[PDB]
Symmetry: C4
Subunit: 392 residues, 4 copies
């Protein structure tokens, strides 16, 4: 059925495979059997994965205290601390995810009704295409991350650096994957578990934005349904009952958006600050040189992936606001014959409520906020290439 | 007849002469015979002109990779890439320009009616004066661009640089017009075609803003008609029917503005970013020295032309918002005798809809946005003369 | 009588003594005999004074081209160009000042009625106190400007610099008053006329803000009367007629504010940009050293005078907005017994019209705008003490 | 009884012990016996304490003129000048605190009624927990301030600096507590009074924000009561009388907020500017080194205390706005059966009045303002670590 839960659980299950946001019964097709219970496999697997990520974070924390924390070395701190914070706020999200999916399904039942329709791409495929695209570019980003690592490292072995060292898996562990052997012993088994934990951590880092876009698509789907219903009664005389039901469904979607915002404030702030940090870092690294063209394509693919993923996630979140405002223009089309007060309330609502996702009410995710973020990042760069001018 | 299409086709035809925004039948006086069909002369001429501009862009792209892309050398990249992007978004504009002029004419028929009037300058002359002024200052900018080039170059030949080289057309090609002979062979014919393609590209660069101001004038003309109708019933008792028809025409103009904004979002973002780049470059070049006074007058004439054209185009786009808001004050004049709900709706509309052109809803072209742009450019300069402080 | 014209003409006459904003009949107590006619004494005296200021501006223009225009030397350019621009926009203001005072008096007649009252300080004394204070601090600023000049110059004569030069008036002319003898011959008569023209130009520079505050006080007086009338009917049952008349007077004051804004847009932009420039200059000169304590007290008295005069003029202009919004709170006090639609219109008006003075609709003079200006000046300083860091 | 006055007087009395904001009868349980009378003990004790703080300020003023006022030495100027300014604006606050607590109690009597309720933490305990937490972290901040001082100073005595000097109380006075013996004679008695005056001054500095949060909690308590009453009638048919009484209580709370804002504008601006200065200083001191780990923990505990106290005080002030807006969502839940105009007025009010504390209407303390402050501080740091880059 065209439900949000049935559109996420193919990806919620994949996230719980790397133990993201633990819940019991995420594979079930019913959103009421999913619980947060400590007596099963999933909190245990997320706890083991969390201690793995915590040993990673602590080992690199001590390693970069031994080597010195700089703006160039803080990237690992933000990455692993943000993975652990995503784990924590995902546990908190799962504490209400029973209730969150309960209210989501409860308010999305009327959106699978004859008054509404599925235009071209149902929520299933609409979520699946974008989520598989993000997973594809995430696998690509990590793919050419290892590609750059191993080639630059071996095509560096072939020149100096004791050429007799045969490029191998364990050598790649002990050279390109540092901050793990000053605390943990060197071993093939710990090395493959380190690959698994690092791939899982990259999955956390990207699934943060990926999940936020899943939420944004789930809300924008129903808001597009409301706007399409409003457009279907464009040049026709609308009864007061239809306007009342449209207003009630819009109020229910505002309710769901507010509840999701309350449950997701930690995650939205985390992803917004995390994307600000990483995009400002990679734009801080725009006007410099890299070692080989493989590193060039990897870094630029990271740059477009990161900037476009931030832009696409925030544009899908802003699509909630834009889709609520798109029905405003069609409501302004209404003639004097059917005004009936309710349309006035609905127009006032979408004109003054600025219905959109928010961090913690500090900022509302809108196209206006996206442009403000673009300008803020531009100014931050204009001061940062002066910050790091002598280094490059 | 006082139509937008009859006010642009004297300039649409001139733009299609240099093959801008190709359409078939642009010379016709009827806006329904204009089509986007691949089987005629105009898409062929714009394709030849587009490959010409593309060879220009690629040749200078390779030339500036050979010489190094800097902030001073990126100007050519932005210029030719923006000419090609204007070509592309103008093709996309022409994909809907049948429909765009259809809706424009359909909603502008009631604006040529006895309830409305032509105050002093009809849309024909109002468009023609400003468009001929922009074409005049564009011809002037390119005129003293060549003036500065050839004099500085020959009055540079008369001092060193192998004075025996007689100043000639082919020499001006092979010295002042670089980035074309490292890919294309040197020839008088390719040289005159290069002059034609460069003049056409400058025409693209200026006709971007020129067309945006044409659109802004076309919308502001009808909005001024609405405001004049509202002012004509200032101290008189207004019937409900007149207010209803005024509200319906205002809603239709908002419809036309929204449709034009959807069809012109690419072009508006292109011109806004392009003007931001060029104005910030020329203001970046305010506090420096040039070689001869002819270069001084050319550069300062470029500076006033660019800044005043950005200001005038964005002020004409903001004239839509200011003209919609000017009727708000006259609507506030209305006594309690004729309020009739409709005036309340209309006041709420022009108070909260911020009717104006937009990039992609990232920003709405208003006088407030113009002042914000002025402040943003001031701050960008305050960091950029620190960026390029040691260079000057 | 408590009129704006009778409250300004004691200062309009003083401004026309130094030939500011020429009008014929400014001394008359009737605002309809004041005209802009070229056949009398006042346009002749302002023309002579304007050519005097123009010779000053041109002589210093050539002198600072001979010496080099810098940010430190541009102060004279802005000062004299702003005096001449104040002359020009004051001529333009006087072109409508017949009509401006006509509409001002016409809409301020109902404000001298029994429904309104004069609380403590009538418009006469309210204008007179602030205007005499500004004239006093202007005379003080110019007073210690000459004090610093002549002492620092003579107590500089007593050490080196050919001590035999007796400190005299002509010597102060030929040393501390430069940019006048490279074009005009040296003479006691031209020197005393130069003192008169310089004092008049300082009077222009300060009377810009002084006149803007006069306008702001004139509008805020009537807006305070409206707010006091609204507060007088706080806990009483208000008839619909009283609310209608209050709304009509508020609309008439908005009309007068809009007309004055249209007639004063040039002057308001001039004074706002001029104050921005001078305050940013003096704050640019905060963290440096001067020569003697007399120069210290003069410069700091200039600093507090300039900053406090900008703040006070913009706060009086924002007092229009704050006073319109103060009645909003009292209107919110109204019980359900007397709502009568008109109060709803009035509340919507002062909630969404942002009734205030504006430059050219680029910005509305409000306390919010004052705080934004404070932050903008803070950021401009944060980049400017980096601009001029090596100089100090 | 659950009153604001009975929730502050356990802390008002403690503040008057160090002579903060003098009033006569602050220990009484009735808010009408508290007066501002010059004939008793409290204005005398605050005058003695004020001359003590004034001798401190003047002595350090002369000492830092003798040594040179820098951005690093201006901290003492701002600290003691802000303590004296808090004394002055607290005297002004006490000039109306009779009236302020009169209106506060008068409008908070209906909030102790059966229509309202005390959810978990009454205003007594809600104020007490946060106030004791702030007093605890203030005692902690000053505690490790002395801890860092005396250890670093003695564990500095044990290395060079005439080790024979036995670490003592008088030695700590004459070394770590300077700017007091160049004006006052050295004596154990003046030294213990100096400790008392410095602890009292730190209490002023922290009780500024502590009192502002007390006010914010007092207002947010009643606003939470209003929101809880609105939520209690969520799915029930609400009578018009209940909505009218809710609107009247909301208007009365807006009245109390406006009166408190008028009486507290000086203190709110003082605390906001003071927190801006100190937070920007400590963030200016984030990326540097200190001498010993005790200084490290003291400075970082100061940093979290200062940043979190600014954030918590401004978040409690913004809790007024957020709590007024939280009832807006529940009011949007209301069906068409009971709209009754009054709900429309109330929705318009909390949608457009932006009910919150303000400095002097320059800025309204909201979560939006908190995010704007965060961004402004970020930009200020981005220019300040360039200001002090060569120093660190
Ligand atoms: O630096 C620590 C650790 O994580 C890095 C960078 O933080 O890799 C992460 O970033 C890449 C690029 O986005 C991800 O694809 C990858 O999965 C993440 O682990 C890497 O250098 C280190 O292994
Ligand atoms: O630099 C490449 C190419 O275009 C330039 C500058 O980009 O000339 C353009 O700019 C001038 C000034 O606005 C236009 O008038 C001209 O038509 C444009 O082609 C020129 O230097 C180069 O030929
Ligand atoms: O610099 C030219 C000319 O004007 C100055 C500064 O521009 O004096 C003006 O500024 C002072 C200080 O506000 C005014 O009081 C004075 O009246 C103005 O003329 C002076 O240096 C020069 O004479
Ligand atoms: O510097 C003068 C004086 O005050 C200081 C710093 O200004 O101590 C104040 O700051 C600390 C840390 O917040 C407070 O705990 C303390 O109570 C205040 O007095 C101190 O260096 C000087 O004694």
């Amino acid at each position: 059925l065209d439900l949000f839960h049935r559109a996420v659980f193919p990806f919620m299950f994949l996230a719980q495979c790397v133990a993201i946001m633990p819940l019991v019964g995420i594979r079930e097709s019913n959103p009421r059997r999913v619980r947060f219970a400590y007596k099963s496999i999933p909190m245990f697997v997320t706890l083991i994965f969390m201690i793995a990520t915590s040993i990673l974070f602590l080992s690199m924390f001590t390693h970069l205290l031994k080597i010195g924390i700089t703006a160039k070395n803080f990237v690992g701190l933000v990455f692993f601390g943000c993975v652990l914070s995503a784990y924590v706020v995902f546990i908190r999200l799962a504490k209400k995810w029973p209730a969150v999916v309960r209210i989501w399904t409860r308010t999305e039942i009327p959106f699978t009704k004859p008054p509404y329709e599925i235009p071209k791409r149902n929520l299933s495929r609409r979520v699946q295409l974008a989520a598989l695209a993000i997973i594809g570019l995430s696998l690509g980003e990590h793919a050419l991350y290892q590609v750059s690592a191993i080639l630059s490292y071996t095509r560096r072995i072939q020149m100096c650096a004791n050429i007799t060292t045969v490029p191998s898996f364990n050598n790649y562990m002990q050279t390109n994957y540092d901050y793990v052997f000053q605390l943990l012993p060197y071993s093939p088994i710990i090395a493959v578990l380190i690959l698994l934990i690092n791939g899982a951590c990259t999955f956390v880092w990207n699934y943060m934005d990926l999940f936020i876009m899943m939420i944004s698509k789930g809300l924008s789907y129903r808001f597009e349904q409301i706007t399409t219903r409003i457009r279907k009664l464009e040049h026709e005389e609308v009864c007061e009952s239809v306007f009342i039901q449209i207003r009630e469904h819009y109020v229910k979607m505002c309710e769901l958006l507010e509840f999701v915002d309350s449950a997701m404030s930690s995650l939205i702030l985390l992803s917004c600050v995390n994307n600000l940090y990483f995009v400002c870092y990679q734009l801080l690294n725009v006007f410099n040189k890299l070692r080989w063209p493989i590193n060039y394509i990897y870094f630029w693919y990271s740059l477009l992936y990161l900037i476009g993923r931030t832009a696409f996630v925030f544009l899908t979140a802003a699509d909630i606001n834009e889709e609520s405002k798109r029905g405003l223009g069609v409501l302004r089309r209404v003639s004097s014959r059917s005004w009936c007060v309710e349309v006035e309330r609905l127009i006032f609502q979408m004109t003054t409520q600025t219905v959109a996702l928010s961090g913690k009410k500090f900022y509302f995710l809108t196209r206006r906020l996206l442009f403000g973020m673009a300008g803020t990042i531009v100014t931050y760069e204009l001061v940062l290439l002066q910050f790091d001018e002598p280094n490059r």
